[PDB]
Amino acid sequence: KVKLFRASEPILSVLMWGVNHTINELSNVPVPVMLMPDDFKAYSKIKVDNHLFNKENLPSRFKFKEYCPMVFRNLRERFGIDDQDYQNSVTRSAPINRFLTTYDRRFVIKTVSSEDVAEMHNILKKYHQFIVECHGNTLLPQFLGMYRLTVDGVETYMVVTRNVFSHRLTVHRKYDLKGSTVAREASDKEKAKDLPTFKDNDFLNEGQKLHVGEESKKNFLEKLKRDVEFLAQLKIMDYSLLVGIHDVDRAEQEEMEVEERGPGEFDPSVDVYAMKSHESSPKKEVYFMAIIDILTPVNPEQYSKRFNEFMSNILT
Amino acid sequence: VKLFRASEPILSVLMWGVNHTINELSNVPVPVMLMPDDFKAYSKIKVDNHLFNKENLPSRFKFKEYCPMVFRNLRERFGIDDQDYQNSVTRSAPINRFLTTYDRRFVIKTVSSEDVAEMHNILKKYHQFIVECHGNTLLPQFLGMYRLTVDGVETYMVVTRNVFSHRLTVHRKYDLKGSEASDKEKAKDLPTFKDNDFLNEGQKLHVGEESKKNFLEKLKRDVEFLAQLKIMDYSLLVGIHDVDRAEQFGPGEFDPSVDVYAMKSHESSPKKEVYFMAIIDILTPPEQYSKRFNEFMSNIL
Ligand SMILES: Nc1nc2c(ncn2[C@@H]2O[C@H](COP(=O)(O)OP(=O)(O)NP(=O)(O)O)[C@@H](O)[C@H]2O)c(=O)[nH]1
Numbered sequence: 318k319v320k321l322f323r324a325s326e327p328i329l330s331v332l333m334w335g336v337n338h339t340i341n342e343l344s345n346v347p348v349p350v351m352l353m354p355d356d357f358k359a360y361s362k363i364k365v366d367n368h369l370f371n372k373e374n375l376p377s378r379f380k381f382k383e384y385c386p387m388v389f390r391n392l393r394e395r396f397g398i399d400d401q402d403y404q405n406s407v408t409r410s411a412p413i414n415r416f417l418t419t420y421d422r423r424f425v426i427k428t429v430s431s432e433d434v435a436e437m438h439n440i441l442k443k444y445h446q447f448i449v450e451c452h453g454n455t456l457l458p459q460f461l462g463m464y465r466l467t468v469d470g471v472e473t474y475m476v477v478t479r480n481v482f483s484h485r486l487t488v489h490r491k492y493d494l495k496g497s498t499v500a501r502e503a504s505d506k507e508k509a510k511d512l513p514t515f516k517d518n519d520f521l522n523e524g525q526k527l528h529v530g531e532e533s534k535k536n537f538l539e540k541l542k543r544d545v546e547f548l549a550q551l552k553i554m555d556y557s558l559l560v561g562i563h564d565v566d567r568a569e570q571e572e573m574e575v576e577e578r579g580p581g582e583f584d585p586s587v588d589v590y591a592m593k594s595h596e597s598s599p600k601k602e603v604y605f606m607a608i609i610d611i612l613t614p615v616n617p618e619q620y621s622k623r624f625n626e627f628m629s630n631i632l633t
Numbered sequence: 634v635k636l637f638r639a640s641e642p643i644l645s646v647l648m649w650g651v652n653h654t655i656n657e658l659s660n661v662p663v664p665v666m667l668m669p670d671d672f673k674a675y676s677k678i679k680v681d682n683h684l685f686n687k688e689n690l691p692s693r694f695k696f697k698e699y700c701p702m703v704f705r706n707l708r709e710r711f712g713i714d715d716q717d718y719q720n721s722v723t724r725s726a727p728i729n730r731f732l733t734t735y736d737r738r739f740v741i742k743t744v745s746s747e748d749v750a751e752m753h754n755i756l757k758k759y760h761q762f763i764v765e766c767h768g769n770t771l772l773p774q775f776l777g778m779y780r781l782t783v784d785g786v787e788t789y790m791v792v793t794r795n796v797f798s799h800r801l802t803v804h805r806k807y808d809l810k811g812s813e814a815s816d817k818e819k820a821k822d823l824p825t826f827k828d829n830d831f832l833n834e835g836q837k838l839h840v841g842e843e844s845k846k847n848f849l850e851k852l853k854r855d856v857e858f859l860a861q862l863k864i865m866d867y868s869l870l871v872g873i874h875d876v877d878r879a880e881q882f883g884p885g886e887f888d889p890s891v892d893v894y895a896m897k898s899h900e901s902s903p904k905k906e907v908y909f910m911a912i913i914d915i916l917t918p919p920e921q922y923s924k925r926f927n928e929f930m931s932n933i934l
C-alpha cells in the first residue's frame with residue numbers, strides 16, 4: 318500500500334505528497350449541501366520541516382498550498398471524477414512530461430504564474446456557475462485543482478486539468494488554432510519535432526478538414542458558442558482550440574508492430590472531447606478538440622467572434 | 634470519517650496529529666534496524682488553514698513527533714499495531730492533563746520540556762533494554778511523544794500503555810515507594826493511597842509462589858537498569874479489582890495480551906481479586922533507592 322513518492326525531481330515528489338495529503342484530509346471533510354462564498358476565498362496550507370526522517374524521496378523541508386479546496390472538489394465531482402481516482406492518478410507513479418501528465422495520461426498538470434492564480438480566483442465563482450448550468454458539458458478546461466509548492470524556498474504554481482487528448486488513443490497530428498488575422502504558422506524547429514504543434518496557417522495550407530457528421534458537429538458548435546460567449550463576458554482573450562487527430566489504421570499498425578516484438582473506440586465519460594469521424598469519411602479517425610489557455614485577462618468580443626467563425630469552418 | 638471532535642481544541646490537534654503521523658509512517662518502510670539518527674530525529678508539521686476545515690480543528694497549529702522510527706519500533710516490540718493505536722486515539726476523543734483514549738487502552742500524560750529532554754537522554758538505552766528483555770518488563774511502555782502548538786502555546790505529551798485494565802474496574806489504588814495520603818486525597822472517589830497507608834491497612838497481594846517469583850525477577854531487572862541509568866523518585870502503581878463488587882460477558886475475565894500487567898488472585902486468597910502492577914514516573918532525573926524499593930516490593934506476596 319506504500320507510497321514512496323519517488324520521482325526524478327523533488328518538486329514532483331512534493332506534488333505527489335501534496336495531492337495525497339489534501340485528498341486524504343478532504344475525505345474527512347463532509348460534502349456540503351452547497352458552496353459558500355468563503356469557499357472561494359479559502360485555502361489550505363501545510364509546512365513540513367522533518368529532521369533526519371523520511372528523507373529518501375521527499376525533501377525534509379517543503380510547503381504545500383491548495384486553493385479553494387471545497388470548490389475544486391465540487392468541480393471534480395461535477396466533472397465525473399472520483400477523488401480516490403484523482404489521487405491515484407497523481408500518486409501511484411510520478412507524473413511525466415513546465416508541462417506534465419499523470420503517469421496514466423488522464424490528467425494534465427501545468428505550472429502557471431502568480432498572475433494566473435489571481436485570474437483563476439477572479440473567474441472561479443462564474444466558471445463554477447457555468448459548469449453547473451452546462452452540467453459539465455463544455456469545451457473549456459475542466460479545472461480539478463490548483464496548488465502552490467514551495468521547495469528550496471521557491472514557489473511554483475500549478476493547475477490540474479483533465480487531458481484534452483485520449484488517455485489511451487494516440488494522437489498523430491495536433492493543431493493550436495486561434496483564428497488571428499495575424500499570420501500564425503509553425504517554426505521549422507517545431508515542424509521537425511516528433512509531434513509538431515501546427516498553427517492556423519499550417520491547418521489552412523493543408524486543406525485539412527474534420528468530418529464528424531451533423532449530430533456531433535451540432536453538439537460541438539453549440540458548446541463553442543456558449544463557451545466563447547462566457548470567455549468574452551469575462552473579458553478574456555488569447556485562448557486557443559487544441560485539436561488532436563488520431564488515425565485508427567495507423568494505430569492498428571503501430572500496435573501490431575509492438576505485438577510482433579475496440580479500434581478507434583473510446584469511452585466518452587473519460588475522453589470527453591473525443592468524436593468519431595463520420596461513417597462516410599475517407600480515413601477512419603478520432604478527433605479531440607477543446608479550448609485551452611483561458612487564464613489571460615485587440616478586443617474580447619471580436620476575439621470570441623473571429624475564433625468562433627474560424628472553428629466553425631474547420632468542420633463539415 | 635474522522636471529524637476530530639474533542640472537548641478542547643488541543644485534544645482535536647492531538648487526534649489529528651496522531652492520525653497524520655501514523656498515516657505518514659505507513660508510507661515509510663520498516664528498516665532492518667534503527668540507526669543513530671533515528672534517536673535524534675523528529676517530524677514537524679505546521680497547519681495554516683483559512684476559511685476551511687475549521688469546524689473541529691483550529692485553523693493554525695503545529696505538531697511535532699519525536700523519534701518516529703524509534704517509537705514505531707517500540708510499539709511493535711510491545712505487540713501494539715499502528716492502526717490500532719491510531720484508532721484508539723482518533724475514533725473518539727480522549728477522556729479524563731492526564732487522559733486515556735476512549736477505550737482506556739493508552740494513557741496520555743502531559744510532561745515538561747525537562748521530561749522530554751530526559752527521555753532523549755535515556756531513549757537509546759531504554760530501547761536496548763526493551764529489545765533485551767523482549768518487551769517483558771514492568772517499566773512504562775512508551776508508545777509516542779509529541780509537542781503540540783495551539784494558540785502559540787507548546788504542550789508536550791507522552792503516550793504509554795495503561796497500567797490498569799481497559800475493561801475491569803479497579804477498586805483500590807496504591808502508590809508505593811518506601812522511605813501517606815492527604816485527608817483531601819482520602820476524600821476522593823478513588824484515592825491514591827501511598828506506601829504507609831498500604832502498610833497501615835495490612836493490604837496484601839496473594840499471587841502464589843509461581844507468579845510472585847517471575848514478577849520479582851522482572852522487578853529486580855527493571856530497577857537495576859533504572860539505577861544503572863541513575864533515575865530516582867519513581868513509583869510502583871498497584872490497582873486492585875474485586876470481582877464480587879462488580880457483580881453487585883464474565884466476572885474477573887481479562888485478556889492478558891491486552892491488560893499486560895494483570896495477575897489473578899491465588900486460590901488461597903481470601904477474596905477473588907485481580908491485581909495490576911507496574912513501575913511509573915521514571916522521567917525526572919540513587920542505586921540505594923533501587924535496592925530499598927526492591928525490598929519494599931519484595932514483601933507483598
Ligand atoms: N482574486 C484573488 N486573488 C487571490 C486570492 N488568493 C490569492 N490570490 C492571488 O494569487 C497570487 C498568488 O497567490 P499566493 O502566492 O498564495 O499569494 P500570498 O498570499 O502573497 N503568499 P506569500 O506571501 O507566502 O508569497 C497573488 O497575486 C494573489 O493576489 C483570492 O482569494 N482572490
Ligand SMILES: Nc1nc2c(ncn2[C@@H]2O[C@H](COP(=O)(O)OP(=O)(O)NP(=O)(O)O)[C@@H](O)[C@H]2O)c(=O)[nH]1
Pocket residue numbers: 416425479480481482491493514557559609610
Ligand atoms: N496532451 C495534452 N497536451 C496539451 C494540453 N494542453 C496543452 N497541451 C500541449 O502542451 C503545450 C503547452 O500548451 P499551452 O497551454 O498552450 O502552453 P503555452 O504557454 O501557450 N505554449 P508553450 O509550449 O510555448 O509553453 C503545447 O504543445 C500544447 O499542444 C492537454 O490538455 N493535453
Ligand SMILES: Nc1nc2c(ncn2[C@@H]2O[C@H](COP(=O)(O)OP(=O)(O)NP(=O)(O)O)[C@@H](O)[C@H]2O)c(=O)[nH]1
Pocket residue numbers: 731740742794795796797808825870913914
Ligand atoms: N488509569 C491509570 N492511571 C494512572 C496510570 N499511571 C498513573 N495514573 C494515575 O494518574 C496519576 C498521575 O500522577 P503521576 O504521573 O503519578 O504524578 P505524581 O507527581 O507522582 N503525583 P501528582 O502529580 O498527582 O501530585 C497517578 O498518581 C495515578 O493515580 C495508568 O497507567 N493508568
